[PDB]
Amino acid sequence: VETISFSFSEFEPGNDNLTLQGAALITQSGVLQLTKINQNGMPAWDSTGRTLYAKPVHIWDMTTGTVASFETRFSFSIEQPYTRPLPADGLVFFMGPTKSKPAQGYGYLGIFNNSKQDNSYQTLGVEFDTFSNPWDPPQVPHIGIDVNSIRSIKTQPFQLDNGQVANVVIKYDASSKILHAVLVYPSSGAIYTIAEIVDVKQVLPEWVDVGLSGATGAQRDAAETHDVYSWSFQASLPE
Amino acid sequence: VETISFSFSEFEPGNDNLTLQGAALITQSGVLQLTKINQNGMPAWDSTGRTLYAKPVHIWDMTTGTVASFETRFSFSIEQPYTRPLPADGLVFFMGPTKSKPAQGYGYLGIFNNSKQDNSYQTLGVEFDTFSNPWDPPQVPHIGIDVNSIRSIKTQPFQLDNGQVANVVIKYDASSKILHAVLVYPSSGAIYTIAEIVDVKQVLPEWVDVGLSGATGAQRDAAETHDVYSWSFQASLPE
Ligand SMILES: *[C@@H]1O[C@H](CO)[C@@H](O[C@@H]2O[C@H](CO)[C@@H](O[C@@H]3O[C@H](CO[C@H]4O[C@H](CO)[C@@H](O)[C@H](O)[C@@H]4O)[C@@H](O)[C@H](O[C@H]4O[C@H](CO)[C@@H](O)[C@H](O)[C@@H]4O)[C@@H]3O[C@@H]3OC[C@@H](O)[C@H](O)[C@H]3O)[C@H](O)[C@H]2NC(C)=O)[C@H](O[C@@H]2O[C@@H](C)[C@@H](O)[C@@H](O)[C@@H]2O)[C@H]1NC(C)=O
Ligand SMILES: *[C@@H]1O[C@H](CO)[C@@H](O[C@@H]2O[C@H](CO)[C@@H](O[C@@H]3O[C@H](CO[C@H]4O[C@H](CO)[C@@H](O)[C@H](O)[C@@H]4O)[C@@H](O)[C@H](O[C@H]4O[C@H](CO)[C@@H](O)[C@H](O)[C@@H]4O)[C@@H]3O[C@@H]3OC[C@@H](O)[C@H](O)[C@H]3O)[C@H](O)[C@H]2NC(C)=O)[C@H](O[C@@H]2O[C@@H](C)[C@@H](O)[C@@H](O)[C@@H]2O)[C@H]1NC(C)=O
Ligand SMILES: CC(=O)N[C@@H]1[C@@H](O)[C@H](O[C@@H]2O[C@H](CO)[C@H](O)[C@H](O)[C@H]2O)[C@@H](CO)O[C@@H]1O
Numbered sequence: 235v236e237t238i239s240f241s242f243s244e245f246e247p248g249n250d251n252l253t254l255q256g257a258a259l260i261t262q263s264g265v266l267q268l269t270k271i272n273q274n275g276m277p278a279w280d281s282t283g284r285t286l287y288a289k290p291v292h293i294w295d296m297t298t299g300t301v302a303s304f305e306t307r308f309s310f311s312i313e314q315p316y317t318r319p320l321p322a323d324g325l326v327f328f329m330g331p332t333k334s335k336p337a338q339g340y341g342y343l344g345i346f347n348n349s350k351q352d353n354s355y356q357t358l359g360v361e362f363d364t365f366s367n368p369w370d371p372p373q374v375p376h377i378g379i380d381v382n383s384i385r386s387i388k389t390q391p392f393q394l395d396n397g398q399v400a401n402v403v404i405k406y407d408a409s410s411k412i413l414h415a416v417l418v419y420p421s422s423g424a425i426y427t428i429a430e431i432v433d434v435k436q437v438l439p440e441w442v443d444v445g446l447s448g449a450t451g452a453q454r455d456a457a458e459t460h461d462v463y464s465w466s467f468q469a470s471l472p473e
Numbered sequence: 474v475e476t477i478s479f480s481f482s483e484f485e486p487g488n489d490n491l492t493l494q495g496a497a498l499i500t501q502s503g504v505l506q507l508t509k510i511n512q513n514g515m516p517a518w519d520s521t522g523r524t525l526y527a528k529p530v531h532i533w534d535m536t537t538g539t540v541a542s543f544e545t546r547f548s549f550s551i552e553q554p555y556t557r558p559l560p561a562d563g564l565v566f567f568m569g570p571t572k573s574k575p576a577q578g579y580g581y582l583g584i585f586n587n588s589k590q591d592n593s594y595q596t597l598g599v600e601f602d603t604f605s606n607p608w609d610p611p612q613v614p615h616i617g618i619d620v621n622s623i624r625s626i627k628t629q630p631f632q633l634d635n636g637q638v639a640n641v642v643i644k645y646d647a648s649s650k651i652l653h654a655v656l657v658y659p660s661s662g663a664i665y666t667i668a669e670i671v672d673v674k675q676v677l678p679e680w681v682d683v684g685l686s687g688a689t690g691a692q693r694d695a696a697e698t699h700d701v702y703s704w705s706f707q708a709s710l711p712e
């Protein structure tokens with residue numbers, strides 16, 4: 235039984251348990267700002283940032299065929315300061331190949347390079363998409379389950395509570411192969427739920443890096459904040 | 474596409490859209506008290522009460538083989554006034570044969586007659602169990618998914634926020650056959666999630682009654698309240 239877990243009630247600058255990539259930065263106030271925020275306090279466009287836990291996770295074993303069950307919880311806030319242009323692009327929790335570097339930003343959220351469903355990506359993600367690309371459903375924002383593609387296999391529209399903290403819970407039961415995610419806004423009491431069957435043995439490599447990635451838009455001011463306040467994770471491999 | 478829906482932001486006494494059975498009663502304050510509350514304001518033991526929506530729901534069609542997707546949301550509160558004996562028994566959201574009457578109370582929650590897994594029950598339920606019977610896991614309270622039996626196929630322990638309002642969301646996606654439930658306590662911000670694969674065509678009859686049932690214990694003072702503040706439901710049959 236290989237178990238791994240971590241819990242950050244807040245982030246500390248200089249911490250060596252997190253790998254910051256791109257624009258990602260931990261403020262002195264303990265907040266993880268995935269995307270860049272200017273001197274004037276406004277979110278910068280054309281920005282991509284990621285944060286990966288410093289240790290790889292054993293998600294499944296090819297020898298025994300066993301797969302781990304896991305759960306992650308995190309709180310974030312997205313603030314959209316401008317009426318026009320439309321804000322973009324969103325943030326995502328993901329699992330993929332170890333030692334990875336940021337991919338394409340914008341609508342690809344820093345984890346994909348195109349809009350193809352390619353098995354070589356070996357990536358599983360739960361997105362919180364704020365901009366409707368041609369591969370997206372018309373409603374934004376939306377939660378989406380991404381399996382080797384930015385074209386979600388399942389989406390769930392939600393209403394953004396501008397600048398309010400949202401609580402997220404993502405759980406994966408290896409026995410039933412169900413990936414269930416929940417988004418709750420304590421401010422308004424709104425609850426959103428989404429679930430889909432995902433066999434990680436068909437998607438991910440045995441060892442993966444777990445992280446959070448965020449991206450702002452491809453044009454001036456098509457931006458918003460992607461702030462994370464806490465993040466915990468736990469995985470248990472019967473093997 | 475056969476759709477049916479209802480939404481009760483509060484309950485009105487005398488309403489003919491709800492079938493009250495057993496001890497169930499709607500107060501002048503708009504609260505649905507599933508189980509009996511004495512003159513002294515304390516919950517009575519040996520009490521069972523149910524509330525069924527007055528119209529049957531078309532859940533699946535045998536001719537076309539199509540099955541409906543549905544979602545229900547409700548708020549309730551359980552108050553446990555005594556340290557001893559242990560409180561009991563809990564409440565449950567259920568779907569089963571039309572024109573049904575209350576079954577055994579106590580640990581059977583008013584919807585089962587024994588602890589056998591019998592296909593003739595044709596009942597699907599999501600319980601919020603407060604007393605650990607011999608067929609129950611040791612942890613209480615717990616959320617459970619019941620399929621033709623009081624012995625849940627899946628359980629999830631949760632911490633009771635005594636007398637606080639809990640918000641529940643239960644969703645069923647016919648395409649994936651996933652039944653996902655969420656319990657949130659706004660008071661503490663606690664979020665609980667549970668999911669399992671359930672093929673309703675193998676469990677329920679084509680037409681069903683949807684309801685809520687609650688029960689108090691088999692001995693003096695083994696009791697608690699089972700108050701419901703609101704309840705909404707919607708189902709869509711592609712046929
Ligand atoms: C957040 O970051 C923290 C800081 O990095 C993490 O804590 C570190 O976790 C390290 C485990 O990876 C741990 O490393 C060991 O350190 C031992 C010496 O330090 C302790 O003992 C000292 C006295 O002897 C004392 O003064 C210190 O205060 C510590 O108590 C050392 O003996 C160990 O070496 C043995 O094991 C390694 C690995 O098998 C062998 O390589 C080695 O030969 C020997 O057999 C080990 O040393 C580390 O070895 C690998 C090498 O690359 C590293 O440089 C070397 O440090 C380290 O002690 C702590 N640091 C502190 C200050 O406690 C923290 O990890 C979590 O908490 C720790 C305690 C542990 O339980 C981990 O499993 C947890 O993940 C990070 N938190 C998270 C959630 O990631
Ligand atoms: C909560 O309870 C409410 C009260 O019971 C529900 O509202 C009732 O819903 C009934 C539908 O089942 C509806 O019944 C129809 O009433 C028609 C006459 O009343 C209307 O028109 C009057 C003037 O003509 C006006 O004064 C009234 O105020 C109403 O506007 C009547 O013509 C209908 O009859 C036709 O259809 C039936 C069924 O096919 C045939 O049997 C009949 O031959 C004729 O063709 C119909 O009458 C009902 O027929 C069945 C019989 O057993 C009933 O006794 C008879 O009433 C009724 O009007 C309303 N009541 C009110 C005050 O609006 C409410 O239902 C929801 O809302 C209604 C409007 C409808 O949209 C339903 O689908 C909804 O479920 C309940 N809410 C919920 C969530 O359950
Ligand atoms: C100046 C201009 O019109 N530029 C557009 C880009 O904005 C556009 O890229 C999209 O931009 C939105 C935000 O406006 C999101 O970032 C989205 O993910 C991007 O794809 C591109 C391609 O559509 O076209 C011009 O370059």
Ligand SMILES: CC(=O)N[C@@H]1[C@@H](O)[C@H](O[C@@H]2O[C@H](CO)[C@H](O)[C@H](O)[C@H]2O)[C@@H](CO)O[C@@H]1O
Pocket residue numbers: 558559560561562579580581604606689690691692693695
């Ligand atoms: C007086 C006494 O000990 N009576 C017990 C019953 O309580 C018990 O039934 C259980 O009672 C608990 C609450 O105490 C729950 O209601 C539970 O669901 C019941 O099964 C029965 C059977 O165990 O034994 C005596 O009758």
Ligand SMILES: [Ca+2]
Pocket residue numbers: 323341363364365366367370
């Ligand atoms: Ca998008």
Ligand SMILES: [Ca+2]
Pocket residue numbers: 562580602603604605606609
């Ligand atoms: Ca029980």
Ligand SMILES: [Mn+2]
Pocket residue numbers: 361363370371376378384386
């Ligand atoms: Mn999307």
Ligand SMILES: [Mn+2]
Pocket residue numbers: 600602609610615617623625
């Ligand atoms: Mn139980």
